[PDB]
Design a protein around this nucleic acid. Structure first.
Ligand SMILES: [Mg+2]
Ligand SMILES: [Mg+2]
Ligand SMILES: [Mg+2]
Ligand SMILES: [Mg+2]
Ligand SMILES: [Mg+2]
Ligand SMILES: [Mg+2]
Ligand SMILES: [Mg+2]
Ligand SMILES: [Mg+2]
Ligand SMILES: [Mg+2]
Ligand SMILES: [Mg+2]
Ligand SMILES: [Mg+2]
Ligand SMILES: [Mg+2]
Ligand SMILES: [Mg+2]
Ligand SMILES: [Mg+2]
Ligand SMILES: [Mg+2]
Ligand SMILES: [Mg+2]
Ligand SMILES: [Mg+2]
Ligand SMILES: [Mg+2]
Ligand SMILES: [Mg+2]
Ligand SMILES: [Mg+2]
Ligand SMILES: [Mg+2]
Ligand SMILES: [Mg+2]
Ligand SMILES: [Mg+2]
Ligand SMILES: [Mg+2]
Ligand SMILES: [Mg+2]
Ligand SMILES: [Mg+2]
Ligand SMILES: [Mg+2]
Ligand SMILES: [Mg+2]
Ligand SMILES: [Mg+2]
Ligand SMILES: [Mg+2]
Ligand SMILES: [Mg+2]
Ligand SMILES: [Mg+2]
Ligand SMILES: [Mg+2]
Ligand SMILES: [Mg+2]
Ligand SMILES: [Mg+2]
Ligand SMILES: [Mg+2]
Ligand SMILES: [Mg+2]
Ligand SMILES: [Mg+2]
Ligand SMILES: [Mg+2]
Ligand SMILES: [Mg+2]
Ligand SMILES: [Mg+2]
Ligand SMILES: [Mg+2]
Ligand SMILES: [Mg+2]
Ligand SMILES: [Mg+2]
Ligand SMILES: [Mg+2]
Ligand SMILES: [Mg+2]
Ligand SMILES: [Mg+2]
Ligand SMILES: [Mg+2]
Ligand SMILES: [Mg+2]
Ligand SMILES: [Mg+2]
Ligand SMILES: [Mg+2]
Ligand SMILES: [Mg+2]
Ligand SMILES: [Mg+2]
Ligand SMILES: [Mg+2]
Ligand SMILES: [Mg+2]
Ligand SMILES: [Mg+2]
Ligand SMILES: [Mg+2]
Ligand SMILES: [Mg+2]
Ligand SMILES: [Mg+2]
Ligand SMILES: [Mg+2]
Ligand SMILES: [Mg+2]
Ligand SMILES: [Mg+2]
Ligand SMILES: [Mg+2]
Ligand SMILES: [Mg+2]
Ligand SMILES: [Mg+2]
Ligand SMILES: [Mg+2]
Ligand SMILES: [Mg+2]
Ligand SMILES: [Mg+2]
Ligand SMILES: [Mg+2]
Ligand SMILES: [Mg+2]
Ligand SMILES: [Mg+2]
Ligand SMILES: [Mg+2]
Ligand SMILES: [Mg+2]
Ligand SMILES: [Mg+2]
Ligand SMILES: [Mg+2]
Ligand SMILES: [Mg+2]
Ligand SMILES: [Mg+2]
Ligand SMILES: [Mg+2]
Ligand SMILES: [Mg+2]
Ligand SMILES: [Mg+2]
Ligand SMILES: [Mg+2]
Ligand SMILES: [Mg+2]
Ligand SMILES: [Mg+2]
Ligand SMILES: [Mg+2]
Ligand SMILES: [Mg+2]
Ligand SMILES: [Mg+2]
Ligand SMILES: [Mg+2]
Ligand SMILES: [Mg+2]
Ligand SMILES: [Mg+2]
Ligand SMILES: [Mg+2]
Ligand SMILES: [Mg+2]
Ligand SMILES: [Mg+2]
Ligand SMILES: [Mg+2]
Ligand SMILES: [Mg+2]
Ligand SMILES: [Zn+2]
Lengths: 147, 110, 240, 46
RNA sequence: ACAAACUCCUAGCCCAAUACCGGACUAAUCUAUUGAAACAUAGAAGCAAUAAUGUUAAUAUGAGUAACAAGAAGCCUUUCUCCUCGCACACGCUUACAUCAGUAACUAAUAAUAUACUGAUAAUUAACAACCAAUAAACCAAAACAACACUAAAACGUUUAUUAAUUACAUUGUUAACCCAACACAGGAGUGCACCAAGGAAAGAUUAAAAGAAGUAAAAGGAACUCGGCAAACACAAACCCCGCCUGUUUACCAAAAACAUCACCUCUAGCAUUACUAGUAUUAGAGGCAAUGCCUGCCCAGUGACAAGUUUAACGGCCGCGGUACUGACCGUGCAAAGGUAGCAUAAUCACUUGUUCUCCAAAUAAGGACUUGUAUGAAUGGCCACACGAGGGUUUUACUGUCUCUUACUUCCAAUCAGUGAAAUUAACCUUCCCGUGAAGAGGCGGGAAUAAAAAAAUAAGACGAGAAGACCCUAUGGAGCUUUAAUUAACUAUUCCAAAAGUUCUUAACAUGGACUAGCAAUUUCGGUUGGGGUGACC
RNA sequence: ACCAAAGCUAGCUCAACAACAAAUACAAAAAUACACCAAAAUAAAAUAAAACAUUCACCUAACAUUAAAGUAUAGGAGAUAGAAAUUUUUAUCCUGACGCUAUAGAGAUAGUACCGUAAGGGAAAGAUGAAAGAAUAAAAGUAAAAAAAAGCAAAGAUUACCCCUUCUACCUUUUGCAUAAUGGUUUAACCAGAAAAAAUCUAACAAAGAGAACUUUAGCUAGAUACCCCGAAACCAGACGAGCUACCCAUGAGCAGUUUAAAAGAACCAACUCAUCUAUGUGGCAAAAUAGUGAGAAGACUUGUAGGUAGAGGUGAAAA
């Protein structure tokens, strides 16, 4: 009935912070891969003709979009109604604001779909890191050009 | 002295299956001409000796009733009788035990 | 844990009172003084050591008392005498030749011509002659007798200075006492107590004395025959 | 001589040494009760 | 000629290894995506037991072995045959007790059947026993068949006065074959009457081997046995020693003694009051020594003590040379000491020599006793010497007695062996488990050279298996422990001491408490006890 | 073919968020009579310093978090110990699980059985089905199925099991072990390598790099690579123990006969008490007994009930 000699000890946290530019270039590479394998599709508008999920599935089939799909919109408040409903009714399809793009999810869905203002967004944010200085204090604080 | 090694099952099978430790087959068994049960040649029949024994027990009970107490025992010879029998002159002057069962075939009159 | 002492009695009875002996132990039940216990069971008999003790609070004068009997006591080494007068009986320590059917005088009065005293006499120290033999000497007047009670012991009056007597205790240390202290004149009873032989070890267990330890010890620096200049006079007179 | 019979049963001595009252009279006795309640024993005191 | 991992030959995935250090792969889980029946890339870890006298559970072996129990016959409770811890209460146990019923299997160490297992039902009824007033006062006066006494000085209440609810029936203990020892233990258990009137069975059935246990008898001899006359006796008595004086007390479980105590004799320390000593008071009371009685108790205050420079040995402790001379030395010289060992006793329960010398004791004696006796290491309260009386102490002789023994024997009973029940223990790498002589980590059933040899039981004996039991109590080594002692080194608290301040007053004092800093002791703390070494110590060296 | 074997649940981890009524301290579970109440004094040592004396974090308190910084300082100036000034921190909501499945996870089906006088220690276990208001044959050990000259038990092989021929069990420990050195009957389940200063390896960005404080003469930042398990005798604090035994204090109780003027620590010898000597017994009948044989046996005698003294202590006719 004795004690365990070594065994798992206490609540353990695995926490390590990758340097920023590595995370950024990771994001870039994921986008690049998506594009060069033909599995990226840029969309504009995103207004749906109707809220019926069958429309979205058939729209996947007729365009041969592959099995699972992720959709990325610029903002969370600015999402159109029909889309929110129709997508919130499905597992294989998925809907996310642009703030929440990430590598793991990009690899989890066979097909990525971006709104146009979303490309205008990402391209800007990510491109900004080649030309930046090393941070002085946390970037949330006031800088000359950067908000 | 403590045994130096556990013995193998081989050695044990040798020792305790020996023809000497086996139970011998008794060859003197026969059947008793009366009740046809089994008995050994030199021994009385068990089943016969039973009915003999029971009857002896009962006749001893009735002759215990014919006696008044522990120390009081008859000076005459005794003769036991069964339903329908009357004493012969040879047997008169003797103590008589009277019984309900008609005289059993294996017990003779003499 | 706890204990209660046996010595609770508020009143004076001459009838012997039952006493509970405790061999060697203090009230916390630990051995304090070694080698005491298992004696023969004894009753205690109360002694009045204040010999001049006016019986009725109203009349101040001197006592005349009578000796009814002289008995053995287990509690002390000296012999005890039962003395009565008026309505009062008392056990007092008997002087050496005191016999039953005797007369005793108790007075606190000090005359200038002193007195010639018998043994059963109790007088104030200053009223006795210079040469006399005393016992049951009181320390401070009114306190009762303390010194010289043992079997066959005596003190002796030596000199008198400034209304204060000087006595010699049995150890021969000298004691300074006010004149008004009462003392008894004589020797304590049973002077042969010292010559008694204890025959066997048995008598010791009868007197209630346990055998000594079996531990062996070198004698220390304390042992040897030391010859000391006699310890100086004890003075119970206090300065003004 | 032969040993192991050391315990000679007495009901008076049992209640007087280990009984509830004896415990409650002294602080440490009280803590014996307390520890025994914290372990949740069926029987607190003799 | 025959002979290797060497070297050829034919093919390759192409050259040994303990500590430590590099590499490549993978078993089983889980999590990400795939995968669909066993999954493949990653990420993670309680990530892999042939070995800890490992832990738990279960199985063997030893082993159907050791060991366990019920007196006979009958008509089934009736006679017999034998032995005697019996009935109550107290304490303590708790239904184990009672009736009826059941027992295949559980309890009984087996059965039969049942006071002890299982179920159901019942049960001990108070006059015995528990529970059950105070305060005042008189009363000095033992139990002991109690007349009267003895020393050790003795447990226990009446009566008078003042008040005490006053009122059927309170409440509670009442079984037993029993309790404390793990057990339905050859054991431990208080009291009153008993010796049976009451309680109980020593053998389950045989057989009559050895070896063991207990008992009985023994020709001739009577200690010749042996460390010792231990055990045993148809004996049961005498004597001599040593040590203790004596009765007593101790190492529960290896020592009852010469050890301790003790009467007695001596040293110290104390002049006094509410809980010890002590309701005492120096003829008393505490620390101790040495052990009755008798004769004794020598000389030594320099050291260390201890006391209040000086004093002390019935305090710790000591108590001599060297040569000259009548073989010896009464004498002599000189030296050192605080004194120079005396009275006794003596080869000794007394370092060694040593089995000293000699006499008695026996056929013979290292034993015993008596003497001599420098014991160069006896010796007088750390007691010296004699002596009664006493030792389950040690030794020696004699009588007597006998199986101790010459030198064994017969017979019974428990074991014993066979039949029937029930059924353990240490131990055990695996064993298909010989002998000899060599060899070998130096003593072999396993190696080498030879021998011998169908297979298994049961019974015996103990030479071996460095047999089984206890991580050797000896020895040494750990910068491991502990107990004891002091001049080890560091030193408090406390108990006492003495002093200075403080505190009160005087113009230098301290009544009892009581704080700060010292001092001087007691009791007392904390921590260690270097290393090399032909093992350690002593010696020597660093 | 027996003995066995298999289930997935009971519940746990870790973390977020925030049945009265009566009876009871008489010897608890007892309606009821005169009192008393109540109390407080530093944590020590084990261990580090390779010994050990000064010193040795954590052990009480809250203060948190990112820094200043392992810096100022403090230390047989050794071992180690260690601040502050001054700076940083956005709300709730949003719960779960690369946590365990009956030797695990709680000790837990329980603080119960049981073991202890007492403080205290402290287990083991459950498994069919919708319905019981329906009756896999795989561990060791054995059985089916005793054993035939020979030899670490196998291997080379053979028509053929042996028969031939060749081979010093395994670990640990050592200079060297077949050793007659240690360990283990056998099976199953459990049962033992943890850290990121410097370094190397792979990447980011580069005279700079890091999501704040820092480091920079190719550097910085991130990942990955690392250091066991079981054992004393001890020492310190606080509890609980005198129903055994040591000694006391209460209150009771025994001691017949025989001898002697006698209860005289006198004789003889029972009950009762001790334990001398021998033999049995040695996992016993018994964790100290039984059989014989012995000492004492009106006393310093035995013995019952009830108190007391507690470990730096008690008690001691000293045997530590
Ligand atoms: Mg656990
Ligand atoms: Mg006295
Ligand atoms: Mg003495
Ligand atoms: Mg002594
Ligand atoms: Mg016990
Ligand atoms: Mg060749
Ligand atoms: Mg190699
Ligand atoms: Mg593991
Ligand atoms: Mg295994
Ligand atoms: Mg073993
Ligand atoms: Mg193992
Ligand atoms: Mg078996
Ligand atoms: Mg055998
Ligand atoms: Mg047998
Ligand atoms: Mg029998
Ligand atoms: Mg009773
Ligand atoms: Mg049975
Ligand atoms: Mg009762
Ligand atoms: Mg009772
Ligand atoms: Mg009864
Ligand atoms: Mg036992
Ligand atoms: Mg038998
Ligand atoms: Mg025989
Ligand atoms: Mg014989
Ligand atoms: Mg004989
Ligand atoms: Mg003969
Ligand atoms: Mg001889
Ligand atoms: Mg001989
Ligand atoms: Mg001889
Ligand atoms: Mg004899
Ligand atoms: Mg001699
Ligand atoms: Mg003696
Ligand atoms: Mg006697
Ligand atoms: Mg004893
Ligand atoms: Mg002993
Ligand atoms: Mg003995
Ligand atoms: Mg002596
Ligand atoms: Mg004196
Ligand atoms: Mg003498
Ligand atoms: Mg002298
Ligand atoms: Mg001489
Ligand atoms: Mg000698
Ligand atoms: Mg001498
Ligand atoms: Mg001396
Ligand atoms: Mg001497
Ligand atoms: Mg005498
Ligand atoms: Mg004696
Ligand atoms: Mg003798
Ligand atoms: Mg049998
Ligand atoms: Mg063989
Ligand atoms: Mg050799
Ligand atoms: Mg050999
Ligand atoms: Mg046999
Ligand atoms: Mg042998
Ligand atoms: Mg061998
Ligand atoms: Mg041997
Ligand atoms: Mg060893
Ligand atoms: Mg050592
Ligand atoms: Mg050490
Ligand atoms: Mg210290
Ligand atoms: Mg040394
Ligand atoms: Mg050495
Ligand atoms: Mg040497
Ligand atoms: Mg050597
Ligand atoms: Mg030396
Ligand atoms: Mg250390
Ligand atoms: Mg170390
Ligand atoms: Mg050390
Ligand atoms: Mg500390
Ligand atoms: Mg569990
Ligand atoms: Mg219990
Ligand atoms: Mg099998
Ligand atoms: Mg062969
Ligand atoms: Mg070899
Ligand atoms: Mg090993
Ligand atoms: Mg060696
Ligand atoms: Mg060897
Ligand atoms: Mg060995
Ligand atoms: Mg070894
Ligand atoms: Mg072994
Ligand atoms: Mg680093
Ligand atoms: Mg570089
Ligand atoms: Mg220490
Ligand atoms: Mg230490
Ligand atoms: Mg008590
Ligand atoms: Mg007691
Ligand atoms: Mg008598
Ligand atoms: Mg006598
Ligand atoms: Mg005999
Ligand atoms: Mg006798
Ligand atoms: Mg005698
Ligand atoms: Mg004693
Ligand atoms: Mg001694
Ligand atoms: Mg000793
Ligand atoms: Zn027939």
């Amino acid at each position: 009935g004795g004690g365990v000699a070594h065994g798992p000890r206490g609540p353990t946290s695995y926490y390590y912070m990758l340097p920023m530019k590595v995370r950024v270039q990771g994001l870039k590479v994921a986008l690049t891969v998506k594009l060069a394998q033909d599995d990226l599709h840029i969309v504009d508008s995103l207004e749906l003709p109707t809220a019926d999920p069958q429309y979205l599935i058939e729209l996947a089939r007729y365009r041969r979009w592959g099995d699972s799909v992720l959709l990325v919109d610029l903002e969370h408040e600015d999402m159109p109604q029909n889309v929110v409903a129709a997508t919130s009714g499905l597992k294989t399809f998925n809907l996310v604001p642009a703030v929440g793009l990430n590598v793991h999810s990009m690899l989890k869905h066979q097909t990525l779909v971006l709104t146009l203002p979303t490309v205008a967004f990402l391209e800007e944010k990510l491109l900004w890191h080649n030309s930046r200085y090393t941070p002085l204090y946390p970037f949330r604080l006031p800088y000359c050009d950067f908000p | 002295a403590a045994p130096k090694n556990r013995r193998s099952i081989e050695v044990n099978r040798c020792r305790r299956r020996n023809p000497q430790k086996l139970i011998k087959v008794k060859n003197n068994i026969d059947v008793c001409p009366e009740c046809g049960h089994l008995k050994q040649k030199h021994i009385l029949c068990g089943y016969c000796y039973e009915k003999v024994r029971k009857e002896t027990a009962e006749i001893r009970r009735q002759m215990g009733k014919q006696e008044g107490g522990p120390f009081r025992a008859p000076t005459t010879e005794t003769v036991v009788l069964y339903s329908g029998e009357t004493p012969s002159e040879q047997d008169q002057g003797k103590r008589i035990i009277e019984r309900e069962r008609k005289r059993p075939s294996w017990f003779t009159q003499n | 844990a706890t204990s209660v002492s046996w010595k609770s009695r508020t009143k004076y009875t001459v009838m012997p009172v039952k006493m509970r002996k405790s061999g060697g132990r203090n009230h916390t039940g630990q051995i304090q003084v070694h080698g005491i216990g298992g004696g023969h069971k004894q009753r205690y008999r109360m002694i009045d050591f204040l010999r001049f003790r006016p019986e009725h609070e109203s009349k101040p004068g001197p006592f005349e008392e009578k000796v009814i009997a002289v008995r053995y006591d287990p509690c002390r080494s000296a012999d005890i005498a039962l003395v009565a007068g008026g309505n009062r009986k008392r056990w007092i320590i008997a002087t050496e030749n005191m016999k039953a059917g005797d007369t005793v005088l108790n007075s606190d009065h000090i005359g200038r011509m002193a007195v010639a005293a018998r043994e059963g006499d109790a007088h104030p120290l200053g009223a006795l002659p210079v040469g006399t033999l005393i016992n049951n000497v009181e320390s401070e007047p009114g306190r009762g007798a303390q010194y010289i009670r043992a079997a066959g012991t005596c003190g002796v009056l030596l000199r008198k200075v400034n209304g204060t007597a000087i006595i010699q205790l049995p150890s021969k240390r000298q004691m300074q006492v006010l004149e008004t202290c009462i003392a008894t004149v004589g020797r304590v009873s049973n002077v042969d107590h010292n010559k008694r032989v204890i025959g066997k070890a048995g008598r010791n267990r009868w007197l209630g004395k346990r055998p000594n330890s079996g531990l062996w010890q070198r004698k220390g620096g304390w042992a040897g025959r030391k010859i000391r200049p006699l310890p100086p006079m004890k003075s119970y007179v206090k300065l003004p | 001589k032969a040993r192991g019979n050391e315990y000679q049963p007495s009901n008076i001595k049992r209640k007087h040494k280990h009984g509830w009252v004896r415990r409650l009279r002294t602080p440490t006795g009280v803590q014996v009760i307390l520890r025994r309640m914290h372990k949740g024993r069926k029987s607190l005191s003799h």
